[PDB]
Design a protein around this ligand. Structure first.
Ligand SMILES: *C(=O)N1C[C@H](NOS(=O)(=O)O)CC[C@H]1C(N)=O
Ligand SMILES: [Cl-]
Ligand SMILES: [Zn+2]
Ligand SMILES: [Zn+2]
Length: 358
């Protein structure tokens, strides 16, 4: 890697690891469109297995970027429209509060206060129907953004229904395979478990537990190499030869809602570049990111703006991830760690690196 990249990565990430007690970390810096990889520490502390470029990390809510793009691909196939009512795809959702709630609202957390999590008691399809049937919105649809796995999770599950495929099969064949993300998994196969890092929470080794709509909202695992390729794909959608996937990537970076200086895409979130670093750093704190905030609709949605900071945070019990990229500059970063450490520290480090290389 260029000396400037090696230097800023050492000076930024090694102290981050020191400050946050991260056991293992992988970083990809995409500079002039090319990834440069960095690893530290251990995927499995007790076995002393190092992090490598083949180590699988839990992406947590970064998974939503895949869901958003798969939904975009379905839009480009004509299979769904974001204006479609939820009930078009789930007619058994008969309760009246669902009148007026569209796929757009589900995808962008604006349905009116769907909760952050699907309750852990939801174990069956009938449990899931009961949950959504009995949910009472706090707000009218399209007025407040409240980040919610139960919102985009349902979007993902319904967006694939016209295809006749399961969510996992649709994702495999429509996103992972065309992009040659061959070490990216919703369910890690047995032959790949040797690569699956342990997450660490209070010193204990942990993996994310199964939950309703987990694949859609927080359940993807991937390597630093595949995540760099995902960033490249989102930086350069015209290099994707499958037209519906090219367009799906572009649609996931359209701007559907604005609140403050932030814009909601499908999975991805965006700000105009150059960005105020304190905005993205402070806005990543859970106390803000997960708070209800009024939104202004953008109609029509702004087509993907190249001069944007595009990004997504994610966490599981034992992992912390961050992705950010700037299409205009063909610059990006992926940060995968097997400890969940505070978002603002991740975003700060990412902006120190990309700011240095712009
Ligand atoms: C995604 O990682 N999840 C949903 C929500 N995301 O907010 S974050 O991206 O700013 O970390 C909270 C964390 C996590 C979860 N526990 O479901
Ligand atoms: Cl130093
Ligand atoms: Zn040093
Ligand atoms: Zn392999």
């Amino acid at each position: 890697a260029p000396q400037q990249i090696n230097d800023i990565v050492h000076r930024t990430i090694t102290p981050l690891i020191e400050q946050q007690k991260i056991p293992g970390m992988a970083v990809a810096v995409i500079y002039q469109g090319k990834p440069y990889y960095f690893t530290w520490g251990y995927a499995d502390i007790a076995k002393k297995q190092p992090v490598t470029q083949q180590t699988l990390f839990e992406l947590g809510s970064v998974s939503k970027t895949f869901t958003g793009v798969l939904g975009g691909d379905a839009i480009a196939r004509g299979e769904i429209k974001l204006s479609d009512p939820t009930t078009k795809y789930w007619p058994e959702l008969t309760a009246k509060q669902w009148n007026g709630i569209t796929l757009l609202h589900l995808a962008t957390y604006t349905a009116g206060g769907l909760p952050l999590q699907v309750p852990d008691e939801v174990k069956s399809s009938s449990d899931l129907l009961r949950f959504y049937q009995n949910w009472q919105p706090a707000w009218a649809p399209g007025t407040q953004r409240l980040y919610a796995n139960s919102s985009i999770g349902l979007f993902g599950a319904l967006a694939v229904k016209p295809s006749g495929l399961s969510f996992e099969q649709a994702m495999q064949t429509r996103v992972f395979q065309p992009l040659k993300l061959n070490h990216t998994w919703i369910n890690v196969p047995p032959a790949e478990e040797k690569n699956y890092a342990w997450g660490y929470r209070e010193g204990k080794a942990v993996h994310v537990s199964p939950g309703a709509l987990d694949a859609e909202a927080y359940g993807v695992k991937s390597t630093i190499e595949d995540m760099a390729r995902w960033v490249q794909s989102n930086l350069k959608p015209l290099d994707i030869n499958e037209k519906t996937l090219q367009q799906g990537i572009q649609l996931a970076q359209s701007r559907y809602w604005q609140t403050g200086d932030m814009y909601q895409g499908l999975g991805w979130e965006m700000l105009d570049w150059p960005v105020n670093p304190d905005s993205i750093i402070n806005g990543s704190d859970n106390k803000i990111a997960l708070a209800a905030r009024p939104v202004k609709a953008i109609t029509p949605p702004t087509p993907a703006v190249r001069a944007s900071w595009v990004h997504k945070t994610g966490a599981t019990g034992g992992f912390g991830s961050y992705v950010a990229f700037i299409p205009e500059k063909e610059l990006g970063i992926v940060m995968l760690a097997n400890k969940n450490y505070p978002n603002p520290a991740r975003v700060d480090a990412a902006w120190q690196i990309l700011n240095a290389l712009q």
